[PDB]
Amino acid sequence: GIGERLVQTPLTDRCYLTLTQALESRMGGNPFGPAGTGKTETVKALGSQLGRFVLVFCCDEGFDLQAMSRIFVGLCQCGAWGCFDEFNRLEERILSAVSQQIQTIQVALKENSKEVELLNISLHQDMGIFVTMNPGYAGRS
Amino acid sequence: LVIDPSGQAMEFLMNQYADKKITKTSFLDSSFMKNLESALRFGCPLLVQDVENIDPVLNPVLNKPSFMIFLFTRDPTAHFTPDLCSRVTFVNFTVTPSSLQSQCLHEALKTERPDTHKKRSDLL
Amino acid sequence: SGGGKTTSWEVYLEAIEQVDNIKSEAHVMDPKAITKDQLFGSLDLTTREWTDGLFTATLRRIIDNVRGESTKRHWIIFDGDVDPEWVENLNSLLDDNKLLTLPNGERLALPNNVRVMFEVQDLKYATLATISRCGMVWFSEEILT
Amino acid sequence: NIYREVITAAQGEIALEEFLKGVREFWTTLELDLVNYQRKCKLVRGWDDLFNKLAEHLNSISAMKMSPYYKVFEEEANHWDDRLNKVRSLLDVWIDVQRRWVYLEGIFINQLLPAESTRFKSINSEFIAILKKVSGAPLILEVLAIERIQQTMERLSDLLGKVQKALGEYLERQRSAFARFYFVGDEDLLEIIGNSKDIIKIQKHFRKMFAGLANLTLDDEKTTIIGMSSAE
Amino acid sequence: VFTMNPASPDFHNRSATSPALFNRCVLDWFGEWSPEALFQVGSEFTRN
Amino acid sequence: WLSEHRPLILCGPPGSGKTMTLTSTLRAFPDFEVVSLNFSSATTPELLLKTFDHHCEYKRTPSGETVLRPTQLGKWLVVFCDEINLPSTDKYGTQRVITFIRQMVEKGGFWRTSDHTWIKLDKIQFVGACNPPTDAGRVQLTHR
Amino acid sequence: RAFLDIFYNLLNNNPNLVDKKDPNERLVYLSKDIFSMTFNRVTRTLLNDDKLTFALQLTIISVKGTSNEIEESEWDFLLKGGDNLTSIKETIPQLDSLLSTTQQKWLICLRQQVPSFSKLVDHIQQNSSDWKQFFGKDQVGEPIIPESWIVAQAQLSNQQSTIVSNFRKILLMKAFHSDRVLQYSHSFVCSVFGEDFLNTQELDMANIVEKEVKSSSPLLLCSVPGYDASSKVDDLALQLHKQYKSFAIGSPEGFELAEKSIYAAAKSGTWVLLKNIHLAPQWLVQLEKKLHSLSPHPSFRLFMTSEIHPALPANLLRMSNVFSYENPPGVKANLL
Amino acid sequence: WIEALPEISTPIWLGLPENAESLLLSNKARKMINDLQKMQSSEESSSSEDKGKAKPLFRCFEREISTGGKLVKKITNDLANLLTNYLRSLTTSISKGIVPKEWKWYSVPETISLSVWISDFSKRMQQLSEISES
Amino acid sequence: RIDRVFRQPQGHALLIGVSGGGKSVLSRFVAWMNGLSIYTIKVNNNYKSSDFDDDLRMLLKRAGCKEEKICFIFDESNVLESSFLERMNTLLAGGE
Numbered sequence A: 001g002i003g004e005r006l007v008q009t010p011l012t013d014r015c016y017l018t019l020t021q022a023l024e025s026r027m028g029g030n031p032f033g034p035a036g037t038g039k040t041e042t043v044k045a046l047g048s049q050l051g052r053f054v055l056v057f058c059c060d061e062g063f064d065l066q067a068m069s070r071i072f073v074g075l076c077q078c079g080a081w082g083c084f085d086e087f088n089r090l091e092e093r094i095l096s097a098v099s100q101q102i103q104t105i106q107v108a109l110k111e112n113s114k115e116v117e118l119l120n121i122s123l124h125q126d127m128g129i130f131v132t133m134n135p136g137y138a139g140r141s
Numbered sequence B: 001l002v003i004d005p006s007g008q009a010m011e012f013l014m015n016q017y018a019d020k021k022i023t024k025t026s027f028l029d030s031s032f033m034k035n036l037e038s039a040l041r042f043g044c045p046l047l048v049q050d051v052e053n054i055d056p057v058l059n060p061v062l063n064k065p066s067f068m069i070f071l072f073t074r075d076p077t078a079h080f081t082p083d084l085c086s087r088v089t090f091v092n093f094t095v096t097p098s099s100l101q102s103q104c105l106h107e108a109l110k111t112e113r114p115d116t117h118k119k120r121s122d123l124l
Numbered sequence C: 001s002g003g004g005k006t007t008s009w010e011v012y013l014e015a016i017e018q019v020d021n022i023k024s025e026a027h028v029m030d031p032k033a034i035t036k037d038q039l040f041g042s043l044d045l046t047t048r049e050w051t052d053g054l055f056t057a058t059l060r061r062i063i064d065n066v067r068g069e070s071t072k073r074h075w076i077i078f079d080g081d082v083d084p085e086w087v088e089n090l091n092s093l094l095d096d097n098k099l100l101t102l103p104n105g106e107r108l109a110l111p112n113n114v115r116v117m118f119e120v121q122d123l124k125y126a127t128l129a130t131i132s133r134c135g136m137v138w139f140s141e142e143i144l145t
Numbered sequence D: 001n002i003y004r005e006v007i008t009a010a011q012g013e014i015a016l017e018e019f020l021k022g023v024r025e026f027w028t029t030l031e032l033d034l035v036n037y038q039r040k041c042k043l044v045r046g047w048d049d050l051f052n053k054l055a056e057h058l059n060s061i062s063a064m065k066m067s068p069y070y071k072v073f074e075e076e077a078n079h080w081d082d083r084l085n086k087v088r089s090l091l092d093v094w095i096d097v098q099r100r101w102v103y104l105e106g107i108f109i110n111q112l113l114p115a116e117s118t119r120f121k122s123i124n125s126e127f128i129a130i131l132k133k134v135s136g137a138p139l140i141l142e143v144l145a146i147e148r149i150q151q152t153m154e155r156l157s158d159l160l161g162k163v164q165k166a167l168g169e170y171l172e173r174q175r176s177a178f179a180r181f182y183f184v185g186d187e188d189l190l191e192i193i194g195n196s197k198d199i200i201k202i203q204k205h206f207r208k209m210f211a212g213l214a215n216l217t218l219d220d221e222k223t224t225i226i227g228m229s230s231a232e
Numbered sequence E: 001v002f003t004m005n006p007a008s009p010d011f012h013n014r015s016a017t018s019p020a021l022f023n024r025c026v027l028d029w030f031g032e033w034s035p036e037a038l039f040q041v042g043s044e045f046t047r048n
Numbered sequence F: 001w002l003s004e005h006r007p008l009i010l011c012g013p014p015g016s017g018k019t020m021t022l023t024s025t026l027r028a029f030p031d032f033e034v035v036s037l038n039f040s041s042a043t044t045p046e047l048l049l050k051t052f053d054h055h056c057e058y059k060r061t062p063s064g065e066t067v068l069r070p071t072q073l074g075k076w077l078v079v080f081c082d083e084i085n086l087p088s089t090d091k092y093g094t095q096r097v098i099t100f101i102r103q104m105v106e107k108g109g110f111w112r113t114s115d116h117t118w119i120k121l122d123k124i125q126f127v128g129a130c131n132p133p134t135d136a137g138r139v140q141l142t143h144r
Numbered sequence G: 001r002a003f004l005d006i007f008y009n010l011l012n013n014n015p016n017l018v019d020k021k022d023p024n025e026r027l028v029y030l031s032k033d034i035f036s037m038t039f040n041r042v043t044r045t046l047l048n049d050d051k052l053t054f055a056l057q058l059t060i061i062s063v064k065g066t067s068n069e070i071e072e073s074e075w076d077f078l079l080k081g082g083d084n085l086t087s088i089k090e091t092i093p094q095l096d097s098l099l100s101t102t103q104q105k106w107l108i109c110l111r112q113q114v115p116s117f118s119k120l121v122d123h124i125q126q127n128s129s130d131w132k133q134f135f136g137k138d139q140v141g142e143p144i145i146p147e148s149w150i151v152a153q154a155q156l157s158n159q160q161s162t163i164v165s166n167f168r169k170i171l172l173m174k175a176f177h178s179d180r181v182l183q184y185s186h187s188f189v190c191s192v193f194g195e196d197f198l199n200t201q202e203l204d205m206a207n208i209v210e211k212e213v214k215s216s217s218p219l220l221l222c223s224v225p226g227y228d229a230s231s232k233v234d235d236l237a238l239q240l241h242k243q244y245k246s247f248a249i250g251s252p253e254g255f256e257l258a259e260k261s262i263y264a265a266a267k268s269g270t271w272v273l274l275k276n277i278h279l280a281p282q283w284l285v286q287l288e289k290k291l292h293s294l295s296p297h298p299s300f301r302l303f304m305t306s307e308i309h310p311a312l313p314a315n316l317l318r319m320s321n322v323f324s325y326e327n328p329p330g331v332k333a334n335l336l
Numbered sequence H: 001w002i003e004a005l006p007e008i009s010t011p012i013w014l015g016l017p018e019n020a021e022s023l024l025l026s027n028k029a030r031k032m033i034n035d036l037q038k039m040q041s042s043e044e045s046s047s048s049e050d051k052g053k054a055k056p057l058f059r060c061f062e063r064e065i066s067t068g069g070k071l072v073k074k075i076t077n078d079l080a081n082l083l084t085n086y087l088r089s090l091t092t093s094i095s096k097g098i099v100p101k102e103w104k105w106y107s108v109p110e111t112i113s114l115s116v117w118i119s120d121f122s123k124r125m126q127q128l129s130e131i132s133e134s
Numbered sequence I: 001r002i003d004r005v006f007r008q009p010q011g012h013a014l015l016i017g018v019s020g021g022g023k024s025v026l027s028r029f030v031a032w033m034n035g036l037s038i039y040t041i042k043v044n045n046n047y048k049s050s051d052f053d054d055d056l057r058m059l060l061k062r063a064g065c066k067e068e069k070i071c072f073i074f075d076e077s078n079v080l081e082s083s084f085l086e087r088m089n090t091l092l093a094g095g096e
């Protein structure tokens, strides 16, 4: 439709590269930093820039697990983009749950695997998983 | 209420009353409540590990046919409460510096010189 | 407290219905008088049964011209305490978003004839994430000598 | 000497007697606490309450068999053990049928899944028919007297279960047929499946399948699609 | 009949929470077994 | 203060004469049915509600609204909150029970979470007591 | 229960006690073979850095009650190395032609504290042609303690012992060369247990998990963030002929399902494994309480894996042969 | 070429100034030392009484003394209580070797011994003073 | 002193004292006398509020409905949850 388009700042580009170049490496993107910079928006802008169907999965809340497990099937098939806003905000229990899943999809996705064995489902190449968050501690993610 | 962290105590009882049959249960697995009623009536030693989380359902027993419960604690600093302290007979087993020094002096004399042990043993 | 707040927006809304003739209906409610799950709703983890919330519904009656609410301007003032709690479920509405989505994927859009506000005494318990996408209007008590 | 072994024995027995009194008077009259269901039927409420009472009495009946006075009321003790047990077994399969039905109830669309929409009618038939013999005689011990209700409710359980299983297999297909569908919860999905025609009752769900596509455009006839409209 | 102990960790806590306690009932501080008691309870238990 | 029906507070030490002083004066009022509520640390806005569904009644005025009036016809209900300054504050200093009261005093009604329909108080005023916030367990009252 | 073993193996399975049988003579070995054996079992869990730290304690304890016993006033200074320095107004002016501001206060704390370091200030003020290079900045020759002092002090006290003299150097170095403490400490320890003592001997997972560990205690492998011990177990499991059954302790169906393999494993005697146990902070606690009570068959060797994380409940590591792993120094090692 | 490479590798290989190794050895020597000062205490008071013996730009400065000076009263009045929920933990760090929480009103390195923190604050204060009269 | 408290409308006792000092035993006695019925709260590590509330009914009825003399001895080790006091609180104040 009309949607929203960010401003291609010198950062938006240096970020656009890290993701594309890294997304081409069959690996999900993870932009950290102090909340309020573009971590999410930029990621959404990239997908909307490639005619993709990016999805913002709001964490730091009641993040349903029984729902997430499902939705992933859609991302893998439709070939949509899964963006976890503040992905580090998930309770250790749930955070460990999803993490384990993304591990499954992303790992098998780096081998070209036409179909993942999550939860065997079809794995589309254009599909992509993105996890935003705050900077770690002293450089560590 | 054996406050034994080194585990030596627990090891002692399980070998002392192995005849009377002992159950190494604990306030953990549900098997507990089931084991007690068994040991209680049918008579036979017990042993409830981790007494840090004891239920107020045992009280009636800890205050009175032919058995004996053994409350244990691996926490050498376990800060108990008044109620539990009163209805129980503490038995500390934490190995202090002096104590352990004694255990080695013996377990060494009984080996690095068993002869001089048969003398004190047999004689006395 | 007692600075002219509750009175200010009361004269403003009442006066706009003449310079525009359009009715400026408002909806006040203490966001702390009820449990958060009643201010936005929740999901029954036994049948996916969704129990509507106060704000969720009050925003619906407007999108659904049951009584013809679109025929006028609206106002949803949260006359209550503010914390980084019942405010986060609105982020995706206070900014460009404009959609108080719900766990059941209801996705409630926000018209242009509807405005949300707050009448808090303080924000000492508010984070830079609560206000951020909000209009700050200091109401010093010194105003009402 | 002997005058104290009998006195205590007489008191120790009347205790077992007294105990059975509350059990014999609680189950030979206790009626299932039913509740109207949207004017279609009446389910059973207060499960945990019925179970707690069944478990309590059954535990005291099984233990009182090691008492020096059990030999007397041994026949009535074992009788209740049987009765009360069959009661707990029936309720377990019932609370399953009660639920399994309620869910499938708000569903059976039917013209799309006949193979199962018909298999449900047979279950829904006898169910509403049996629940009547229950609503009339709520006596938990009377309902347990129906013609092999156990073998009957267990069948409704299995059957009702065989239906819901097929549903998940169908919904699972509807999704694998239209990828997007994995974004809409089973809830909204069943609604989107039933309104295959009334596009109007689906317009509100599009935003959760397509990026910008918010509303579809229909021709002056309101039967054919022309274009798509974005939320903006 | 409220029967608590002075030692109990959460002592001064079980108070503020419920006012009715130290405002309704009659507080009879049993205290500790006085020296006079200990003596009599010992002589009476070792009589035979 | 009682004529205008204001939520006056009888702050004072334990046994000062608070509860008494009130009940006595309430006598000089023909239509004043009082109710005694004992607040504490758990006294949330919900509990205060439970007391209403046992002394008041939800009536739908011929207009179309729905008022909360004392069961007894033509009688002002007085909800006396004994220990009103005891309610515990959430993780954001907020005695939900107080904000709930303020919402009924200033605004004049509270939202009924079930059908989300404004419920205006007919003849139900307030009046509470307590000790100075200086005492333990006590929590200063919001200026609002 | 772990220590008692080293003690036991000392009196029995001691590799150096297989010969001589005389008890009066055997004692001589044990009296020393206790520190060696102990350090070996412990050094397997101690990270490189901490490896030395422990070595020191064992030393001071060994040379205890001997002519080499270190003064409790000196060891008190090593740890309490003038931590008050930030408040010493007294000075040493007649030495401004050498020591600096903060550099002077140190010499005082040394003289003020340890007795065997009081005459120091003078020894230095005397033949300054010796300490010149020590305190002397730009010194293209690792600072050196003037042999005049090392000996002038040795006799200035009945303490004419080598080991003692060695330790002392550390004190002097901690006050003027806080970068030589690690070195000189190593030298001290060696003069007591031999330069071969601290020699980090390569392991041998053979005797370890097979003939040096009961089925009662697992073998948790706390690795460093950025490395996985996974492979380690696998390469040894298969290359030994035995059962196996890894498990990803993180996924939802990983908790319950997995445990079973462990139970039966200990029942018959099969090897297991659980990586990233740290990912399950709230689970491991359960494993502990359980594992503790369940006598397994001798052919049992439950393994564990994770990274040095506080998650692992104390009761967990305590009941197992923990093995610390960390990428060593040097550029060569990195490349290879 | 690599196997023929010498094990040990100096900080010069890393483009770092040879001295670099001196800093590492120092800290590693200190940490080791600190550990021994613990494994000694656990295998073995009136401190406050001592430390108590101490205690356009126009817009900026004003605040420098205001916000800072406010801390002075805090330290004085808070510590004076030497002879609640806050007062409790405030004494934990003093006996554990860490600067009490609520005191860090200014940017200061995490690992900074108690004795130092206080000292700096003292000199850091005479700083604001010299500006007043100026 | 325990007797006085019993023979009086809304007579409750708050016996503070050392453990096993006779607080319960002596209370049961004076209770047994004035025709009161001592009701306990058999608890365990696996109790709850949904349980206390239930038992709070068996009691409240036996007194208000069946007009019976009960002596509810509530020991500290019984408040296995906050809510328990909130209930005991109002119960002490307005027997409701």
Ligand SMILES: Nc1ncnc2c1ncn2[C@@H]1O[C@H](COP(=O)(O)OP(=O)(O)O)[C@@H](O)[C@H]1O
Pocket: A005, A006, A007, A008, A009, A012, A034, A035, A036, A037, A038, A039, A040, A041, A042, A132
């Ligand atoms: N390059 C840009 N052009 C235009 N707006 C931007 C740009 N970068 C950031 N912003 C604005 O800053 C905000 C950053 O928020 P967002 O990125 O959504 O949260 P987070 O920083 O937590 O990911 C956005 O609302 C956006 O409008």
Ligand SMILES: Nc1ncnc2c1ncn2[C@@H]1O[C@H](COP(=O)(O)OP(=O)(O)O)[C@@H](O)[C@H]1O
Pocket: C001, C002, C003, C004, C005, C006, C007, C008, C119, C144
């Ligand atoms: N222009 C004015 N002159 C004098 N008094 C006023 C004026 N405007 C409002 N007031 C009075 O002052 C009070 C201000 O309260 P207000 O700020 O509206 O409520 P709140 O404190 O809840 O925001 C009102 O009760 C009103 O009677």
Ligand SMILES: Nc1ncnc2c1ncn2[C@@H]1O[C@H](COP(=O)(O)OP(=O)(O)O)[C@@H](O)[C@H]1O
Pocket: F013, F014, F015, F016, F017, F018, F019, F020, F021, F129
């Ligand atoms: N003027 C007075 N006349 C009669 N009795 C009084 C008077 N003042 C105080 N009292 C007594 O003191 C007690 C005060 O209790 P009350 O006021 O009910 O509790 P609180 O002061 O905690 O609200 C009453 O029981 C009453 O008998």
Ligand SMILES: Nc1ncnc2c1ncn2[C@@H]1O[C@H](COP(=O)(O)OP(=O)(O)O)[C@@H](O)[C@H]1O
Pocket: E003, E041, I018, I019, I020, I021, I022, I023, I024, I025, I026
């Ligand atoms: N005066 C006394 N003489 C002998 N035994 C006593 C006396 N008072 C109490 N006891 C004993 O001490 C125990 C106290 O138990 P109880 O009163 O139930 O607990 P508490 O005192 O902690 O409430 C009783 O079992 C009783 O046998």
